[PDB]
From a paper:
The methylation of U1498 located in the 16S ribosomal RNA of Escherichia coli is an important modification affecting ribosomal activity. The protein comprises an N‐terminal PUA domain and a C‐terminal SPOUT domain. The latter is responsible for protein dimerization and cofactor binding.
Comparison with similar structures suggests that [name] is an [name]‐like enzyme that can target the equivalent of U1498 in the [name] ribosomal RNA, thereby potentially enhancing ribosomal activity during infection‐mediated effector production. The multiple copies of the enzyme found in both structures reveal a flexible conformation of the bound AdoMet ligand. Isothermal titration calorimetry measurements suggest an asymmetric two site binding mode. Our results therefore also provide unprecedented insights into AdoMet/[name] interaction, furthering our understanding of the [name] catalytic mechanism.
Residue numbers in the entry:
A (entry chain A), B (entry chain B): 3 to 244
Amino acid sequence: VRTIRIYQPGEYQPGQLLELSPEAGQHVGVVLRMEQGEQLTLFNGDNKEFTASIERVKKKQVFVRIASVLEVNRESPLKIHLAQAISKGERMEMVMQKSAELGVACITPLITERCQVKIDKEKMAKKMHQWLNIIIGACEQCGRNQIPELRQPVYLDQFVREAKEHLKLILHPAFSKTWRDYPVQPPDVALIIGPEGGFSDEEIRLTSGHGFLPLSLGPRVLRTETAAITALSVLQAAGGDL
Amino acid sequence: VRTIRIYQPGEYQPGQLLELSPEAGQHVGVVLRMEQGEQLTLFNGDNKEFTASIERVKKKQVFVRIASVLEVNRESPLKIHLAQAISKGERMEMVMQKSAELGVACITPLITERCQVKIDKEKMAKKMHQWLNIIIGACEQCGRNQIPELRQPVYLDQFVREAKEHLKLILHPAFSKTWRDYPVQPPDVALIIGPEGGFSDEEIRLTSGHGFLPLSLGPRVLRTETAAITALSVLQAAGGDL
Ligand SMILES: C[S@@+](CC[C@H](N)C(=O)[O-])C[C@H]1O[C@@H](n2cnc3c(N)ncnc32)[C@H](O)[C@@H]1O
Ligand SMILES: C[S@@+](CC[C@H](N)C(=O)[O-])C[C@H]1O[C@@H](n2cnc3c(N)ncnc32)[C@H](O)[C@@H]1O
């Protein structure tokens, strides 16, 4: 059995008793049901890991004894900024979880013409909150000791205007080329993946106007959430740490 | 936009009047509520797309008239054999779907040491039916006109003994070799992926001894079902049609 990893930002040092955050301590003592003397690895989002053991469980609060600090970085050298068309429900959560597993540096939810979602300020905020916790959960899972940035949703126009990454790719069949036709390598990539219905010709004219080049992923139509993970897999395997 | 795709095995020809299989009629007649006169693209599993029109719908009996046949092959030239350790519930469903979207040729459900599944012949024949249907659904969605082969569950020990693919790979986070260290090319490749708990040292011992060579997918630990998506994406990108 592997050791449990818990996100706990902030600075602290070995030998120090730490009171776990509300969510951290509620994860450990309540959800995981762990007891005094059990072991834990904490990470702070800054690429450090802290070995620890549970000493006192008082209600939902959890106190942990730090054993040692170690600098452990599992980031890819290829920084990909995913711009993912918003899908309803579980598929978007799937993308949030697995794109973090695949080293994604930064995620922008994208509102595009053929997205089928209701854009409510209250609703969007809840989604953003839920998405960030899924990301942190995936980072506890996969070993990343730095949380990827989850940026506020923007329309296609804004994102394509502000995009400054050195390689800029959109998943779209027309005039597309495979990963071998592009210079996939650090520093960074902007990657647009669209909604189930795809993109309008006007949207392609706008993205193509701002330097986004068309990338294919084989002759089979991939689902929207499949396409994110496949695209990240292929780009990391080409010019990252896969 | 594009016509609804329905898997319909068997032999049939342009100009025939054809009664759809019960599951196909259920899908067309009840789920999708399709009307007489609407169009279907049937595929029989032999890289043929039949254009047909719905001539009568009576609950879940559906009769179509075949108009034309077109040979259309969306199979990867790399034949990948995924042997996926069996995981709980919806994780394995994701593997079946994504791997068919990704062009997998053959799937073997795999029983490894740390799998936590009750070996029940009633459960397992049922589960094999549910996995098959997820696969078939995936070919309908993604455009494969040929169903991947779904084999019976076998234990790791037997699978590794019997494997005959020209390139054999075992996926484990504590490896360092990447896809670039191997001749990933036709005809075929066998790939072994572990459960949520991974492989034991004994299993790594066993598979290495039977010629499965070590493959890593970067320094982050992927969920069992993420690893199937990433591994197939990378292998199709390297030697298939991605
Ligand atoms: C990834 S798809 C999202 C929709 C997905 N089919 C679903 O069910 O949710 C978004 C757009 O990406 C494009 N796309 C999908 N697979 C592709 C591929 N293999 N090569 C190039 N573009 C692709 C398609 O044009 C699609 O309209
Ligand atoms: C959740 S992982 C198993 C974790 C477990 N603690 C272990 O490593 O022994 C499930 C499967 O995904 C595959 N996998 C996950 N990350 C991988 C990586 N970075 N490189 C190669 N295989 C990986 C392995 O085949 C593993 O058995």
